[PDB]
Ligand binder design. Structure first.
Ligand SMILES: C=C(C)[C@H]1CN[C@H](C(=O)O)[C@H]1CC(=O)O
Ligand SMILES: C=C(C)[C@H]1CN[C@H](C(=O)O)[C@H]1CC(=O)O
Ligand SMILES: [Cl-]
Ligand code: NA
Ligand code: NA
Lengths: 253, 249
């Protein structure tokens, strides 16, 4: 039996709606839960899903270098797999292993329709429209590390305003877009889910970078390569595409 | 130095043009050549580029189970890395290792603009317009194995006409599109290169699947993970994007 760490994030992992309390694995559904189920069938393991205690994905404390979130659970061998929209990044790959990607995406901008804002550069060169990202996530880290003029400028803006423009979650960022003059730097996969459900919102510009989500494992785990092969099987038979359609597809904007 | 196996395929790998003779690695240019140079810089290795003798990527013969191409070079430890638009696939991952993807893509359709054909389904339902793929590549293999009705039908059509509709190169497929009534099933990255240069051609429909190109290594090689890390660094600093813009109406 494997211990699988994960985190609530629509539509990847959600609590099933129910009149009565549910228990154990029965509590959860979503794209990542379907993925876990499919992987379990192919590779023949059982599992217990556990929400990560600190509610974090995994970032390094910039003073002591210690990790948190699902990444820390893996490093500490508290979990066997992390199954979530966990971006494969340079810093994380140095401390844990990942399967090859089950989904590909990039940072982009969530904003309202009908404005003159067409790119990151348009946001960077002003301050009236505030903008931000989830604190300490892969998106924020991209900006923190970027040497590109536009993105460095955006980092200077966000970091100096971290108290007011950085958010704790996608949900908070999305609500900020809906209720104030704010543009949210966020992952394109999640943007697509949002824009299918709110016709007044749109992605602005294209993808600013490229990354994949992968299943995390402790470094050296034999499951990283096994899951890669299972993911390739699922992709090549069209299941990953069906899985995405199931959890994303909206009724039109 | 590491031995790096590769293959000519525009704009990934080409012979550099010069008025004077060129030697060694200097003979080559392209996206993958730039990639290799950058990987070299980060990881601190020297290397020798060699074109794969049999001019194949890597497929398994369904009679004797023998592999060929760059995949075979890696299996036999004749090369340390394969750096090319080499698709990461289930069957290849069973026999060699791969870095994580430096490019992501999918099978799609290259055809002419201004036609009624809007999807694979539209091709499958007819026979007047021929269609095909590079023989024995990842695209053909996708169709050969698929259980999705539309793709299974397309495979049945292609296999019954393989002498006439399967081609030996992307170049041959493109020439087929240009000189006959033919739609070519090919990788979306390469389609983008072609359509930026041939204004009468276009991608039809979306991506039929999703895959990545990765650097291949013999199975168990320590370089697969090292190259993954270097690729992630290159991506995050915007270098892969710059390289794409450089090499890619
Ligand atoms: C839901 C959020 C906090 C996660 C999801 N993937 C990114 C990560 O793996 O860090 C984070 C989003 C982002 O940074 O835009
Ligand atoms: C250039 C061709 C022969 C290669 C490139 N990638 C695919 C591969 O890795 O097999 C092949 C193309 C294709 O199958 O459409
Ligand atoms: Cl349970
Ligand atoms: Na790792
Ligand atoms: Na492998």
């Amino acid at each position: 039996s494997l211990i699988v760490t994960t985190i609530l994030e629509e539509p990847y992992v959600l609590f099933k709606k129910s009149d009565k309390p549910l228990y154990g694995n029965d509590r959860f559904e979503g794209y990542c839960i379907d993925l876990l189920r499919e992987l379990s069938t192919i590779l023949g393991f059982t599992y217990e899903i556990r929400l990560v205690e600190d509610g974090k994905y995994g970032a390094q404390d910039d003073v002591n270098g210690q990790w948190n979130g699902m990444v820390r659970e893996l490093i500490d061998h508290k979990a066997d797999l992390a199954v979530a929209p966990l971006a494969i990044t340079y810093v994380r790959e140095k401390v844990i292993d990942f399967s090859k990607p089950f989904m590909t995406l990039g940072i982009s901008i969530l904003y309202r329709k009908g404005t003159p804002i067409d790119s990151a550069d348009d946001l960077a060169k002003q301050t009236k429209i505030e903008y931000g990202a989830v604190e300490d996530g892969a998106t924020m880290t991209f900006f923190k590390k970027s040497k590109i003029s536009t993105y460095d400028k955006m980092w200077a803006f966000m970091s100096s305003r971290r108290q007011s423009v950085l958010v704790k979650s996608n949900e908070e960022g999305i609500q900020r877009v809906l209720t104030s003059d704010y543009a949210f730097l966020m992952e394109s996969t999640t943007i697509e889910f949002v824009t299918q459900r709110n016709c007044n919102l749109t992605q602005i510009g294209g993808l600013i970078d490229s990354k994949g989500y992968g299943v995390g494992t402790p470094m050296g785990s034999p499951y990283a390569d096994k899951i890669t092969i299972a993911i390739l099987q699922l992709q090549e038979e069209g299941k990953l595409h069906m899985m995405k359609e199931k959890w994303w597809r909206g009724n039109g904007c």
